[PDB]
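A student in our group prepared the protein record below, which I am reviewing. This is what I was given:
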Amino acid sequence: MKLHERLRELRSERGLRLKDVAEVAQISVPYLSDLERGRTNPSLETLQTLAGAYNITVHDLLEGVE
């Protein structure tokens, strides 16, 4: 799947709101939405921060992403 699709899946599967995540990750809601829509590409550092919000590793986060 696309990385954006994976980001969206990780949130949705955990039943979390954008606002909840964004607050933890210290990013804006619209940036996270853009990430999940594939309108902007995340850096590695961003992936680390989201992985921490989802209680996973970046290794885990990328599973399923070709």
